[PDB]
């Protein structure tokens, strides 16, 4: 249980391979 | 008389015609002779003259709430066009 892809549940920083940055609404 | 009342009655007026056709000759005479007087009587009313080579001549009036009545104006003399527009105004009064 050493090597897994970066999209795996086991990966510390799991990757959603989205190629677009999404607008973050202003606070309040 | 009735030319003043287009603004009160119509929300918009569309004049579709063909740029060069025998059927649209009367519509072309109507637009190049009476459009200026109708605009002078109704300054703020949008009277849209839209043209295409294959376009079929028509006279459309939009009333309040999106009710649209289309009247074909093909092969009609410029005076007949004016009568048909008067009938459109009367129909708008009926609503």
């Amino acid at each position: 249980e050493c090597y897994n892809p970066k999209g795996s549940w086991f990966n510390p920083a799991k990757r959603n391979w989205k190629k677009v940055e999404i607008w973050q609404p202003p606070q309040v | 008389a009735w030319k003043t009342a287009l603004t009160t009655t119509f929300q918009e007026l569309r004049i579709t015609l063909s740029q060069s056709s025998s059927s649209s000759a009367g519509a072309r005479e109507f637009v190049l002779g009476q459009y200026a007087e109708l605009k002078a009587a109704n300054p703020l009313l949008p009277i849209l003259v839209r043209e295409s080579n294959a376009a079929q001549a028509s006279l459309t009036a939009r009333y309040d709430f999106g009710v649209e009545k289309k009247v074909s104006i093909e092969n009609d003399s410029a005076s007949g066009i004016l009568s048909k527009l008067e009938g459109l105004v009367k129909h708008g009064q009926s609503l």
């Binding site: 970066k6 990757r15 959603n16 391979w17 989205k18 190629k19 677009v20 940055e21 | -």
Partner: protein, 108 residues
């Protein structure tokens, strides 16, 4: 900060203030560095390796670069201009990343 910074190039094989050609990989995940996109560890990156290697002095205004010592066991032969080069601003082999500089243009 990196989310609104313009992607820039350090300038080893490029210029100090140019745009960096970037794809949209890692843009959703939030990664904005070249090495971060493909390496998830904290070890030394190959770019760190290549920076550690020092520029090599050569004689002449052109150096032939084969990448490796044997011509047929490395990069294609490349001819690099040594004009306007010094230790601080060396010329670079595009295939290998090796850095070169010469003093010959200064009539030496």
């Amino acid at each position: 900060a990196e989310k609104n910074k313009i992607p820039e190039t350090v300038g080893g094989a490029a210029f100090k203030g140019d745009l960096r050609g970037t794809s949209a990989v890692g843009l959703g995940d939030g990664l904005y560095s070249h090495t971060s996109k493909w390496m998830q560890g904290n070890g030394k990156s190959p770019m760190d390796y290549i920076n550690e290697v020092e520029p090599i002095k050569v004689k002449g205004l052109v150096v032939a670069s084969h990448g490796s010592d044997d011509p047929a066991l490395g990069c294609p032969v490349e001819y690099i201009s040594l004009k306007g080069t010094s230790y601080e601003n060396p010329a670079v082999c595009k295939y290998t990343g090796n850095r070169y500089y010469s003093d010959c243009w200064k009539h030496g």
